Amino acid sequence: PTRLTKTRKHRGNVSAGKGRIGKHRKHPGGRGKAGGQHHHRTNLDKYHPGYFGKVGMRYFHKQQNHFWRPEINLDKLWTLVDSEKKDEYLSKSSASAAPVIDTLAHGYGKVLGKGRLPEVPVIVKARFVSKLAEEKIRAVGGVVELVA
Amino acid sequence: KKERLTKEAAAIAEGKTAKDVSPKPVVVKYGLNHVVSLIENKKAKLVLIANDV
Amino acid sequence: GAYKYLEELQRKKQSDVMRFLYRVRCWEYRQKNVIHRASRPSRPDKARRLGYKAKQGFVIYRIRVRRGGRKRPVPKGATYGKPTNQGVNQLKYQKSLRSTAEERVGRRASNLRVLNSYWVNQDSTYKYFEVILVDPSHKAIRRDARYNWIVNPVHKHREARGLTSAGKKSRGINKGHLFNKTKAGRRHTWKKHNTLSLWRYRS
Amino acid sequence: AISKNLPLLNNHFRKHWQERVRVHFDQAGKKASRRQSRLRKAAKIAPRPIDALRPVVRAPTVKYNRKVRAGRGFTLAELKAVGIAPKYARTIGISVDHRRQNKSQETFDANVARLQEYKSKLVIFDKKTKASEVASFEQVDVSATFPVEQPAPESGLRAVEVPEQTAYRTLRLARNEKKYKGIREKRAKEK
Amino acid sequence: AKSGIAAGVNKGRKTTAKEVAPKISYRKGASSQRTVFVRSIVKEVAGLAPYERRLIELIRNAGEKRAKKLAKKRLGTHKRALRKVEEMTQVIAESRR
Amino acid sequence: KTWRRWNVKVNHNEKRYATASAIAASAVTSLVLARGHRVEQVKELPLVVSNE
RNA sequence: GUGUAAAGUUCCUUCGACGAGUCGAGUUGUUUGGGAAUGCAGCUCUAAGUGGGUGGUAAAUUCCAUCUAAAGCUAAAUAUUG
RNA sequence: UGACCUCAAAUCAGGUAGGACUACCCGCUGAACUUAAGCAUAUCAAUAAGCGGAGGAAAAGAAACCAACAGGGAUUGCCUCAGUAGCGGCGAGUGAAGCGGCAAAAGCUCAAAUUUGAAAUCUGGCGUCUUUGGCGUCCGAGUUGUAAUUUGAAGAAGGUAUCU
Ligand SMILES: CC[C@H]1CN2CCc3cc(OC)c(OC)cc3[C@@H]2C[C@@H]1C[C@H]1NCCc2cc(O)c(OC)cc21
Ligand SMILES: [NH3+]CCC[NH2+]CCCC[NH2+]CCC[NH3+]
Ligand SMILES: [Mg+2]
Ligand SMILES: [Mg+2]
Ligand SMILES: [Mg+2]
Ligand SMILES: [Mg+2]
Ligand SMILES: [Mg+2]
Ligand SMILES: [Mg+2]
Ligand SMILES: [Mg+2]
Ligand SMILES: [Mg+2]
Ligand SMILES: [Mg+2]
Ligand SMILES: [Mg+2]
Ligand SMILES: [Mg+2]
Ligand SMILES: [Mg+2]
Ligand SMILES: [Mg+2]
Ligand SMILES: [Mg+2]
Ligand SMILES: [Mg+2]
Ligand SMILES: [Mg+2]
Ligand SMILES: [Mg+2]
Ligand SMILES: [Mg+2]
Ligand SMILES: [Mg+2]
Ligand SMILES: [Mg+2]
Ligand SMILES: [Mg+2]
Ligand SMILES: [Mg+2]
Ligand SMILES: [Mg+2]
Ligand SMILES: [Mg+2]
Ligand SMILES: [Mg+2]
Ligand SMILES: [Mg+2]
Ligand SMILES: [Mg+2]
Ligand SMILES: [Mg+2]
Ligand SMILES: [Mg+2]
C-alpha cells in the first residue's frame, strides 16, 4: 500500500529525503555493473572476490541429466521403509528375512554414509554407495546390492 | 477401338469372354519409357530412334 | 524407363556430352529474353521429380538471374554509422538466386502459383532456372484431387513468402539442433524467447 | 551503480521489453472455453471415448529410467502380437506408432497385455446394432480406465546374501576397467 | 546384455532382449540390379571428368599419394578421395584388357 | 500498466485456517451481534433447521 | 446397391526402382549460445550406393548408434492496440 | 499438296492479377540515439523506419529428429529446464536445447515401375438433362507420358489357407 510508504511522509519537505547537496540524479557512477574494475573495484573486491577471470575448462553442450544422482544418507535410509511396517521390521528383521530398500525407486542415485543405522539387517539396492556407507551397512549385518 | 469395344460388348451380351472375339494385337510399340523397358527386357526386335529429339 | 537414365546422365555434368549440351543451351538462353516461356521442360525428369505433370495448366518459364553477391546500394559507399556496418562489397543476399528466379517469374505470371523450380545452366554472369507454375483457375487443376490444395488462398505467392523448397531452405526450416533458431520461424522464436509471460498468480 | 553487499543480478530488461509483455488475464476464460470444447467434442461422438488408447513406455535418460509413462502409439510388432492391423486399429481408438520399436521384452509384453485388456472391453457396433444397445453404454475415460501404473518398488523381506567383494570395490574395478580398456588392449596387441 | 551395474564397460540394467525386425528404411544404401545396369550404360555414354582423367594419369605414373591429394582437393573429403582413387584404379584394371 | 499485480497468492493451508476460524466464529453470539446481525430472537447458535 | 468387385489379414520364394551444380568441401560476408566455425548467402571445387546425414574440439584409423536429405499436403492446442 | 517444331497476331472463346486495411502472421532489407560512466568489437538489435506476401489464424508439421536410456517418437503452445551450458574489449552484457508435467492430438502424398491384349487420363466447343454437376459427340492436350498400381511404416510380382 502507498499510504504506508515514506513518499507520503516526505510531502512538504523540499528534497524528498535525497539531500540538498547530493541532488538525486540520473546515473552517477554508471549503469548496472559499470566500472567494476575502475571505481567499483572497492565494492567488488570486498564483497564479490573471484568475480573477474576464467577458471576451469568449458563443457560444450552439457546435459545435466547425465549428472543426476541425488544423495540419501544412512541416518535417513530407514525413512524409505514403509511407515506402517517399520517397527515390525525393526523388531523381526533377521538374516533370513530383512527389509529391502530400493533407493533408486525412491529417487536416489548414491547412498552416503552419514549417521548411524539401527543394528538391524537390511538389503540396500543402490546405483552407487560410498565406502563407509557400505561398511556401515555390512556391519549391522546388511548388504548393498548394486543396480543400474 | 470403338468398333472393337462394340464387338466385345456384343460378345459379353452373348456371354463370351470378349477375349476370343478379338485377336491378339500385333502393333508398333511407342513411348520412350515403354520402349526402353522393352529393350532392357530383350523384347524389342527393332528400334527406330528419331534423329531430332 | 528413360527417366532413370536421364537422372543418371544429368549427374555427369563434366562429361563431354553434357558439357557440349550446356554450352549450346547456355548460348541459346542468353540469346533469349531474361524471362521467357519454355515450351516444355528442358529436364522432364527433374520436372517430374518436382511435381510437374504434362497436363494443361502446368507452365514452365525460363529465367536468367545475375550472379554474385549483393553490393550495398548506398550512395558513394557511405553508410553513416559505425565501422561494423561500413561494408559495401563482399556482402551477400540472404536468399538464393533460385528464390529470386522464382519470385520474378511469379511476379511476371501473377495469375499462376509457383509450384517449384530447378537449375538448368550457368555461366559467369548468369544462372538459369526453370520455374514450374500451376494455373489455379484451370479446371484440369481444380478437378485434380492431387493439386486442389494450391487453389486455396493460403498459397498465394508462396514463393514470395518462402514456402517453396528454396524458400524453406533459405529460411532454415529443418529439424534438429542445427536449426534451433529457425525451426518454427526465426522471428517467431525470437519473439517467444523475448516475451515476458506474466500470470494472474505470479510465480 | 554497484553498492553494498548484495547479490549481483541478471535482469535482462535492456531491450524494448514492454512491447512483449503477455499477461494471462484470460486464464479463467481459457479454462472455461477449454472445458466447453471438451464437452462438445465428447457429446458429438458419445459413447465413443474421446481418447485413443496409448502405450506405456520407459522414459529416456539416466535420470528418468525408473519412471514409466504414456507413449505415443503401440508399435507394429505389438499390434501384430494382438492381431490388429494398424489401419484398422486407428479406427477403433488405438494409437499407432511406426517409429517406436521393441528391443526388449518387458515393454513389449506390458503393451501387449494392455492391448488385450482394451480388446476384451471393446464392443464394436454395426448396422444391425440398435439405439437401445448404443444407449446401454456410458462414455468412459480411457486414460483413467487403463491408467499408466508405475511398477512397484521391491519391498518386504528377503534373505541377506553377502558377496566376498564389496559393492564399492565392484564399482571401483568397473571404473578402472573402463578407463584403461583401450590402452590395455593396445598394449596386448603390440605385445 | 548389460552389466547390471551403473559403472564401467557395458553399464546399464539387464533386460530380456527381443529380436527386432529390421526397418526397410535401413536398406537405403544397398545397390540394385536396376541402378547398377543404368549406371554402367550411363558411364559408357558419358565417359570421364577432367579431374578423373588427371587422377588416372597420376595413378598410371605411380603417384598414388599425388592422386589421393588431388582427389581430396577436388571432392572435398578424405573418405571420398579414397573411394574415388579406388574407383579409378578399378577403372584402370578394367581398361588394361 | 496492465502488468500491475492484481491477484494475490495465499497458502492453501492458511486459507483453510481462516475458513475454520470464521466457521467457529459463526457460533459465538457476541461476534454475530457485533457483526450486526439481528439474531436476538434466535434461541441458540448455531441455528440448525430441518431438511424440509 | 451391376460387390464373381474393392480392401485387409497368415505364410513361402524372387525382388525391392527411393529426388545432383544436390550432398559435401574450401573461402568470403553475415548471423547464432554454437565455441578450429550454428544457420543463411555468394564464389570455387564437386560426389556416392550399405551409400548419405547427424552424434556440439580440429585430424587420420577402427567400430557403434540413429535416421533416410536435396519433391509435396494436413485440423487442434498458439497469436491478435485491426 | 500436307505434317512437325519454335515463335507471333486478333476488341478471337473463357478466365485470372493488380488496389485497400493493420493488431496478430511469412520473408527481405536495415540504423542510430542508448549501455559500456570515454570509445571503435559488443550493446541497443538480428529492434525502429523501408520493401514483398497471406489468413482467420498464419507459420511449422508426420524425422536425413532427440538421444546415449531399461530408450523416446510429426508439428505447436504453456510450466520447467534456466539467467543454466555457452557466447562476451570473458568487460558491460547476453543466452538456447534434450529430458520431465501438461494443453491439443491425425495422418499422409508424389518422382523413380511396361496399361503395352489395346491413354484405360484430361480442358474446351456443340447438343441435351434432374445443372456447385450428369450423359452424348467432336476437336484438342498428351506417348518428350495423362490414368490405375507403390511411398520405405513399406511395397511389387508369383504361389498360398481361407477367412473378415
Ligand atoms: C471510426 C470507425 C470506422 C473506422 N474503422 C477502422 C478501419 C476499418 C477497416 C475496415 O476494413 C479494413 C472495416 O471494415 C468493416 C471497418 C473499419 C472501421 C469502420 C468504422 C465505421 C463503421 N463502424 C461500424 C458501423 C458503421 C456504420 C456506418 O454507416 C459507417 O459509415 C461509413 C461506418 C461504420
Ligand atoms: N543481434 C544483433 C547484433 C548483431 N551483432 C552480431 C553479434 C557479434 C558477436 N559474434 C559472437 C562471436 C562469434 N562466436
Ligand atoms: Mg533517503
Ligand atoms: Mg534540490
Ligand atoms: Mg549523490
Ligand atoms: Mg585507470
Ligand atoms: Mg563448370
Ligand atoms: Mg500446353
Ligand atoms: Mg547482385
Ligand atoms: Mg546508418
Ligand atoms: Mg506447409
Ligand atoms: Mg542404411
Ligand atoms: Mg527422398
Ligand atoms: Mg566466415
Ligand atoms: Mg543482414
Ligand atoms: Mg559462419
Ligand atoms: Mg520432404
Ligand atoms: Mg479482435
Ligand atoms: Mg475475347
Ligand atoms: Mg532508449
Ligand atoms: Mg557511452
Ligand atoms: Mg554518460
Ligand atoms: Mg559520446
Ligand atoms: Mg517495421
Ligand atoms: Mg480476408
Ligand atoms: Mg485456431
Ligand atoms: Mg498452413
Ligand atoms: Mg518419412
Ligand atoms: Mg517430438
Ligand atoms: Mg542477442
Ligand atoms: Mg465433352
C161-185: b (≥16 Cβ within 10 Å) or e:
ebbbbbbeebbebeeeeeeeebbee
The angle formed by the CA atoms of residues E73, E78 and E83, to the nearest 5 degrees, is 100
Whether the CB-CB separation of D102 and D78 falls below 8 Å is answered with: yes
CA distance, residue D20 to nearest chain F CA (Å): 11
This PDB structure is determined at a resolution in Å of 2.5
Q: Which conformational region is residue A30 in: left (phi greater than 0), alpha (psi within -120 to 50 degrees), or beta?
A: left
H runs (alpha helix) in chain D: 27-45, 76-81, 86-89, 105-121, 131-135, 142-145, 167-190
Residue position matching grid coordinates 562489397: C89
Contact residues for C48 (Cβ-Cβ < 8 A; gap 6+): C3
The residue of F4, F7, F12 whose CB has the most chain C CBs within 10 angstroms, and thus the best one to mutate to test that interface, is F7
CB A91 within 8 A of CB A120: no
Q: Are C17 and E46 in contact (CB under 8 A)?
A: yes
Q: What is the rounded radius of gyration, in angstroms, for the C-alpha atoms of chain A?
A: 29
Q: Grid coordinates 477401338 are at which residue?
A: B1
What is the residue type of A148? A
C-alpha cell at A51: 568475480
In the sheet with C126-134, reading across from the earlier edge strand, the strands are C35-38, C58-66, C126-134, C113-122
Maximum Cα interatomic distance, chain B, rounded to a whole number of Å: 49
The Cβ-side half-sphere exposure at D108, using a 13 Å CA radius, reads 18
Does residue F33 sit in helix, strand or coil?
Answer: helix
Give the C-alpha separation, D100 to C96, whole Å.
38
Mutation test of the interface with chain F: which of D20, D23, D24, D27, choosing the one with the most F Cβ atoms within 10 A?
A: D23
The C-alpha atoms of residue A118 and residue C121 are separated, in whole angstroms, by 84
β-bridge partners, C129 = C63, C119
What is the C-alpha to C-alpha distance for residues A52 and A70, in angstroms, rounded to an integer?
32
CA distance D170 to E8: 10
- A79 CB neighbours strand H below 7 A: no
Quote the cell numbers at residue A130. 560410498
Query: Is the distance from CB of C137 to CB of C111 less than 8 angstroms?
Result: yes
Sign for the pseudo-dihedral over CA of C154, C155, C158, C162: positive
- Taking CA–CA distances from C42, the nearest residue in chain B reads B53
Beta strands per DSSP E along A1-148: 71-72, 98-102, 110-111, 123-126, 128-129, 143-146
Cα C105 from chain centroid (whole Å)? 10
For chain B, the distance separating the N- and C-terminal CA atoms, rounded to the nearest angstrom, is: 29
Work out whether the CA dihedral C66, C68, C70, C74 comes out positive or negative.
negative
Please state, in angstroms and rounded to a whole number, the distance separating the CA atoms of residues C102 and C96.
10
Contacts of D1 (CB under 8 A, 6+ apart): A27, A29, A30, A31, A32, A33, A34, A35, A40
Q: Is the CB of E29 under 7 A from strand G?
A: yes
Q: Does D106 touch chain E (CB under 8 A)?
A: yes
DSSP structural state of residue E77: S
**Interface contacts A/D by beta carbons within 8 Å:** 99
Question: Could you give the C-alpha distances from A108 to A104, C115, D60, in angstroms and in order?
Answer: 5, 57, 17
β-sheet bridge partners, residue C66: C126
Please report how many Cα atoms fall inside a 13 Å half-sphere around the Cα of residue C186, on the Cβ side.
Answer: 11
